[PDB]
Amino acid sequence: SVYDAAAQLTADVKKDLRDSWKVIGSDKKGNGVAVMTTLFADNQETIGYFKRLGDVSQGMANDKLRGHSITLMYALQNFIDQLDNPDDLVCVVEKFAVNHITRKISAAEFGKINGPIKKVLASKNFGDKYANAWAKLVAVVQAAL
Amino acid sequence: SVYDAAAQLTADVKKDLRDSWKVIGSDKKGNGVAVMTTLFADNQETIGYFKRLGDVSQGMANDKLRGHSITLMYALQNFIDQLDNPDDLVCVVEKFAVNHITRKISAAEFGKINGPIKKVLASKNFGDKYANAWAKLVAVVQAAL
């Protein structure tokens, strides 16, 4: 199932993911926080999953939120580095899904991250072409949930 | 405390961490699996914590172990990237400690990773000076458990 979703990651898709990551991943703290705060803004209900982070309205200034945001970017860094080897990408994606499955985060719930990522990409001038590429990467993770 | 331990990362310690990581971090899959296999070999008692991984003796052939090993290296990548800012290093370490605290991994238990790291370092011509540098970094995490 995860292997099938990984099959959608064509040569052109991987190319756009890498080029866009070269910029997005250059500032993990800045963009990581941008993704989370945007998620909470467009889908307030997702905050129910982050009670441990405390006052998320503080954004960057919130140490726990900042810690989470930075760490989130290293999961994406991981995925991006394994793109050329489906076997490694799959094992890393399934490993990643373990904790999210335990948190009872469905594929649909996880997909709510697509909007934030699309917006962050647009702030760096990466159009729909790139947003679609990232939606496909997220789809690989969704297949594991 | 974690804040006092982070202050132990002096200038030369950070430098040695970077220089050694430049090599060790070049092959996250290979070195990551070596670290885990060494841990299970020198400290068989820790295998109980990894029941989900299955037959750990399969090494690289075990998809779950390989996935975990690769992911582990990205946590270290995270720490290394935060060496410039103590505030970020701390929030990232505390974030990382959450799941390990939940698994009831004590500071003493976590410290068993020092042996494996030292051996992997040695296999790449990096001696005691570097093993001690990494022990200090591991100490920051121990302070958070």
Ligand code: HEM
């Ligand atoms: C591409 C998007 C995402 C990435 C790369 C990502 C990455 C991570 C990482 C690396 C962790 C730390 C390791 C762990 O405990 O699993 C984590 C924790 C977590 N994730 Fe995800 N995640 C993503 C999306 C989501 C979404 C959409 C939700 C929920 C709506 C979610 C909820 C959580 C929660 C609740 C935690 C624990 C936070 C804490 O208490 O510190 N994640 N995620």
Ligand code: HEM
């Ligand atoms: C350099 C030290 C270590 C690093 C960088 C590291 C890194 C990680 C990472 C990134 C994860 C995935 C996220 C999470 O679930 O928290 C993880 C999972 C885990 N770690 Fe640690 N860890 C280290 C040492 C240890 C040690 C010494 C133990 C046990 C004595 C331990 C036990 C666990 C367990 C049981 C899991 C879950 C594995 C699974 O079921 O997939 N870790 N660790």
